[PDB]
Design an enzyme around this catalytic site. Structure first.
Site, PDB file in Angstrom:
ATOM      1  N   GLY A 195       0.788  -1.221   0.000  1.00 47.49           N
ATOM      2  CA  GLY A 195       0.000   0.000   0.000  1.00 47.49           C
ATOM      3  C   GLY A 195       0.824   1.276   0.000  1.00 47.49           C
TER       4      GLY A 195
ATOM      5  N   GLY B 279       4.712   3.663  -4.680  1.00 51.12           N
ATOM      6  CA  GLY B 279       4.679   4.985  -5.281  1.00 51.12           C
ATOM      7  C   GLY B 279       5.150   6.074  -4.337  1.00 51.12           C
TER       8      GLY B 279
END
Ligand code: 3BP
Ligand code: BGC
Ligand code: FUC
Ligand code: CA
Ligand code: CA
Ligand code: CA
Ligand code: CA
Ligand code: CA
Ligand code: CA
Ligand code: CA
Ligand code: CA
Ligand code: CA
Lengths: 191, 254, 142
Positions: free
Chosen positions: B190, B193
């Protein structure tokens, strides 16, 4: 290019120099040193030697454990060195008997408190300043039959027969150590 | 983030929250008022390209406050060399429909020059990784933004220090490992990025992107991050270019 | 050393090894014992490795067994104090002292630069923000 190999630490009284192989043929090196949690600092930038003085870095904290690595140039190829903890591994230099005065039936043998590469306040700290209580000196003497004595300071007070002349030799020793616990014997002195 | 702590509100100002259809998708890093750097794999299964949102100034996903700024993602640029389902070239440059307002809680992370990053930043031991990712492998995501300090490793060391496994992904020159192999701390899925930020002489710089790893905080394994230094030129050239009709754009790399 | 008939006289460390250079045998006649003679010989015949004055740039040589140790002045390092600490102003060395970017230049000194949103100060190494919210700075901590 080829990665360096046989990285070895050559340290005496904290003068620490990293050595390695092989003899560079079309390749230069750059060394990096650090503590496990510290940043990597470069040394001996693009050197063609197979050695690198790391004294100024390790004396900053002789009790830390350092790791060094040698980068090879024609991420770059490299090799890590063994871990090195100065305080526990630097070899004790050959001691020097500073003097010995006879007082009646006893002799005071003094050991020169040699300096180290550890700087402090614009001066070089002595072996005693650095090791404090962890350092002791051992005496190996004889009537000119083996005899020995131990001191936690830089002086020995021993009994001697009147008239007879003795010969002495000392060694710097760090009992708590596991490796390089003793220095070589100092030169032999005779009253 | 596994084994980290809450990033005090405002102390991770460049952190971006990416949503698709209002659902949490990935993390990201703001590098100027209009551009966000995230991970390419975050877009593997996107169907509604017009429903991607970037949120800045976020902190607590259960409370709303005035530091939050939402922006539609007008463009997602991914290297032509990236292959969905894989790990190499895991990077994406996102253009926001409208620039965000720079505030005390919304600040961009610096994109360094290539040589500076390779010659200096790459040798700064610790860097911060952050996100609202899983607190544990296969666990629930975080409500408050978490942050963790992880040490970087040269790839040769990563390989030698990692448990040799079967045919797992290779660690290329476009990646670098960071973290711990004792199963205590690491970023997680999660957090993808999100930034791997490096502090150097008073300023923070973007050096990596949460990309992949075998599980999260798995004994004998390190987290793997996209090596941003390899994409400096690629990114700069794209930020100076004009937008394209569609959202998704694949730009050649190099 | 041995002079005509001197060997008639008993062995003397002072007259033989101090005031003169004594061979191993001469030393052995004074100490007698094998181990004692060797303990003495190892240092006596080692030779002073500092004789070549290997320590450069005002360093001080400290003699050791089959080796030496150079103590250098503050601005010097290296086995023989040959390295000039003031001649390492290059980018790979601690980023050349530059706060942000560093550019090397053969022939002259390296120069420092800054990221957009910052300007290089008069010292030629530091960078100061030229906007309200420069990249890489955390407002609530500044
Ligand atoms: C093991 C599956 S996995 O845990 O999901 N790891 C895979 C790679 C991967 C690694 C190892 C193997 C593998 C193969 C043979 C034998 C053993 C393991 C296979 C794939 C993996 O990481 N895949 C990507 C997605 C690939 C895509 N484009 O869809 C992924 O999940 N990225 C998110 C992520 C972020 C951070 C971490 C971290 N810091 N920790 C871990 C994961
Ligand atoms: C002085 O003598 C030592 C002996 O080891 C030599 O290593 C030095 O190079 C020389 O200057
Ligand atoms: C020996 O030590 C070096 C560092 C210098 O201080 C010399 O002057 C001294 O003799
Ligand atoms: Ca919120
Ligand atoms: Ca004689
Ligand atoms: Ca003689
Ligand atoms: Ca004789
Ligand atoms: Ca005399
Ligand atoms: Ca004589
Ligand atoms: Ca004889
Ligand atoms: Ca004789
Ligand atoms: Ca000698």
């Amino acid at each position: 290019t080829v990665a360096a190999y046989n990285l070895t630490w050559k340290s005496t009284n904290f003068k620490t120099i990293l050595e390695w192989e092989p003899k560079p043929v079309n390749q230069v090196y750059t060394v990096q040193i650090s503590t496990k949690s510290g940043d990597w600092k470069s040394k001996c930038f693009y050197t063609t030697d197979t050695e690198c003085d790391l004294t100024d870095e390790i004396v900053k904290d002789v009790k830390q454990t350092y790791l060094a690595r040698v980068f090879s140039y024609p991420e770059p190829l490299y090799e890590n060195s063994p871990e090195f903890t100065p305080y526990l591994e630097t070899n004790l230099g050959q001691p020097t008997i500073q003097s010995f005065e006879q007082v009646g039936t006893k002799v005071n043998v003094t050991v020169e408190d040699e300096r180290t590469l550890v700087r402090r306040n614009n001066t070089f700290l002595s072996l005693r300043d650095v090791f404090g209580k962890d350092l002791i000196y051992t005496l190996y003497y004889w009537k000119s039959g083996k005899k020995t004595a131990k001191t936690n300071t830089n002086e020995f007070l021993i009994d001697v027969d009147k008239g007879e002349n003795y010969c002495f030799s000392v060694q710097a020793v760090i009992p708590s150590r596991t490796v390089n616990r003793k220095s070589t014997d100092s030169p032999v002195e005779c009253m | 983030i596994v084994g980290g702590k809450v990033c005090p509100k405002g102390e991770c100002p460049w952190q971006v929250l990416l949503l698709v259809n209002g659902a949490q998708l990935c993390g990201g890093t703001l590098i100027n008022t209009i551009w966000v750097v995230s991970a390419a794999h975050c877009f593997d299964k996107i169907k509604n390209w017009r429903n991607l949102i970037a949120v800045l100034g976020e902190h607590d996903l259960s409370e709303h406050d005035g530091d939050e700024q939402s922006r539609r993602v007008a463009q997602v640029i991914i290297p032509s060399t990236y292959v969905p389902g894989t790990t190499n070239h895991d990077i994406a440059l996102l253009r926001l429909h409208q620039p965000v307002v720079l505030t005390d809680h919304v600040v961009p992370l610096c994109l360094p020059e290539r040589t500076f990053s390779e010659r200096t930043l790459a040798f700064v031991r610790f860097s911060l990784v952050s996100g609202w990712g899983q607190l544990l492998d296969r666990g629930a995501t975080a409500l408050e933004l978490m942050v963790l300090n992880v040490p970087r490793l040269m790839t040769q060391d990563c390989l030698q220090q990692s448990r040799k496994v079967g045919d797992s992904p290779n660690i290329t020159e476009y990646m670098f490992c960071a973290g711990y192999s004792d199963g205590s701390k690491d970023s997680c899925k999660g957090d993808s990025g999100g930034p791997h930020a490096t502090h150097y002489r008073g300023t923070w710089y973007l050096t990596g992107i949460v990309s992949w790893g075998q599980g999260c905080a798995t004994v004998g394994h390190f987290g793997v991050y996209t090596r941003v230094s390899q994409y400096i030129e690629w990114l700069q050239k794209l930020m100076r270019s004009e937008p394209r009709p569609g959202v998704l754009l694949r730009a050649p790399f190099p | 050393a041995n002079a005509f008939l001197e060997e008639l006289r008993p062995g003397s460390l002072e007259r033989e090894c101090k005031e003169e250079q004594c061979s191993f045998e001469e030393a052995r006649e004074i100490f007698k014992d094998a181990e004692r003679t060797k303990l003495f010989w190892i240092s006596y015949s080692d030779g002073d490795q500092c004789a070549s004055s290997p320590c450069q740039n005002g360093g001080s040589c400290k003699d050791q067994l089959q080796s030496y140790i150079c103590f250098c002045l503050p601005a010097f390092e290296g086995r023989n104090c040959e390295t000039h600490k003031d001649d390492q102003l290059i980018c790979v060395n601690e980023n050349g002292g530059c706060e942000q970017y560093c550019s090397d230049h053969t022939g002259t000194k390296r120069s420092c630069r800054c990221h957009e949103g910052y300007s290089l100060l008069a010292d030629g190494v530091s960078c100061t923000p030229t906007v309200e919210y420069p990249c890489g700075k955390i407002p609530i901590l500044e």
